[PDB]
Write an enzyme that holds these catalytic residues in place. Sequence first.
Site, PDB file in Angstrom:
ATOM      1  N   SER A  45       0.798  -1.224   0.000  1.00  0.00           N
ATOM      2  CA  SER A  45       0.000   0.000   0.000  1.00  0.00           C
ATOM      3  C   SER A  45       0.836   1.282   0.000  1.00  0.00           C
ATOM      4  CB  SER A  45      -0.947   0.010   1.203  1.00  0.00           C
ATOM      5  OG  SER A  45      -0.239   0.231   2.409  1.00  0.00           O
ATOM      6  N   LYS A  48       0.700   4.051  -2.779  1.00  0.00           N
ATOM      7  CA  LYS A  48      -0.447   4.943  -2.891  1.00  0.00           C
ATOM      8  C   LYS A  48      -0.079   6.399  -2.610  1.00  0.00           C
ATOM      9  CE  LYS A  48      -3.624   1.214  -1.762  1.00  0.00           C
ATOM     10  NZ  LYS A  48      -4.556   0.613  -0.769  1.00  0.00           N
ATOM     11  N   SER A 105      -6.331   3.503   3.076  1.00  0.00           N
ATOM     12  CA  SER A 105      -5.720   2.535   2.163  1.00  0.00           C
ATOM     13  C   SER A 105      -6.757   1.830   1.290  1.00  0.00           C
ATOM     14  CB  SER A 105      -4.901   1.502   2.943  1.00  0.00           C
ATOM     15  OG  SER A 105      -4.194   0.645   2.063  1.00  0.00           O
ATOM     16  N   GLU A 141      -4.752  -3.275  -8.027  1.00  0.00           N
ATOM     17  CA  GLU A 141      -5.214  -3.888  -6.787  1.00  0.00           C
ATOM     18  C   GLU A 141      -6.208  -5.005  -7.095  1.00  0.00           C
ATOM     19  OE1 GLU A 141      -4.310  -3.579  -3.736  1.00  0.00           O
ATOM     20  OE2 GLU A 141      -3.266  -1.665  -3.522  1.00  0.00           O
ATOM     21  N   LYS A 209       2.359   5.916   6.040  1.00  0.00           N
ATOM     22  CA  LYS A 209       1.536   5.060   5.198  1.00  0.00           C
ATOM     23  C   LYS A 209       2.040   3.626   5.311  1.00  0.00           C
ATOM     24  CE  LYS A 209      -1.579   3.911   2.223  1.00  0.00           C
ATOM     25  NZ  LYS A 209      -1.739   2.682   3.048  1.00  0.00           N
ATOM     26  N   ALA A 212       0.942  -4.017   3.876  1.00  0.00           N
ATOM     27  CA  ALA A 212       0.869  -5.442   4.176  1.00  0.00           C
ATOM     28  C   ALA A 212       0.452  -6.208   2.926  1.00  0.00           C
ATOM     29  CB  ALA A 212      -0.103  -5.705   5.314  1.00  0.00           C
TER      30      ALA A 212
END
Length: 263
Positions: A45, A48, A105, A141, A209, A212
């Site tokens: 993540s 982003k 996220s 994603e 930020k 995982a």
Amino acid sequence: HPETLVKVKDAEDQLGARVGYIELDLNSGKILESFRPEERFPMMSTFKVLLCGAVLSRVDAGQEQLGRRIHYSQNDLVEYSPVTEKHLTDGMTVRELCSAAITMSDNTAANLLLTTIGGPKELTAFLHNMGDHVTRLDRWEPELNEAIPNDERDTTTPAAMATTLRKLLTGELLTLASRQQLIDWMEADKVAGPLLRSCLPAGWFIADKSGAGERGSRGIIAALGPDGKPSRIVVIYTTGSQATMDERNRQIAEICASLIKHW
């Protein structure tokens, strides 16, 4: 500090995985500490923040507007979309999508934003033209979190990420208004509680930020400092472990404790 490196070494032993670590002075730009700086780790993540940095770059050039409203449908929603799944009818503005992508996220938010810039290739192209010839995004994603061993797809190095993040937050790329907005989103992070934030004393500034994924993947990038002002960028990655979420978070806690202690 050497003792912080010890904590990272302890982490590698107890997790049974590689750990990437970079300590970068936000003022001078000199690296204060390093561990596996040239090895690749899954971004997860953490990309982003880079993504919304590219979006803001388009905002500065007039190629994009933060207030521009985007609608979408059910067939655009992917796994974990806590914010975007609630605005199927009214849609969301670009500003709200980056807010959802960084603070919560939100995955679908990230995909919609990638559409605004022309996909993962253009995000990579953006990073390439700003000096980062290392960091790469290849998939959308949630496939980008696959974290297959030795796969270079959707990966960065601790050194590349830290230097790139500095350019976004405190560099010449974005306008003063855009730099401030990006770090405002990171400061409003909701999904990184039991990590670096859990370690910090009262009155400290932090804009981060987390990250995982699959195969014991975990990461976090941050811009923090005492006295309510950012003074340092910290990048932490780890992958390959079979350890649970709790233990991985505990290792970052231990590393953080030494970082603040030897500030």
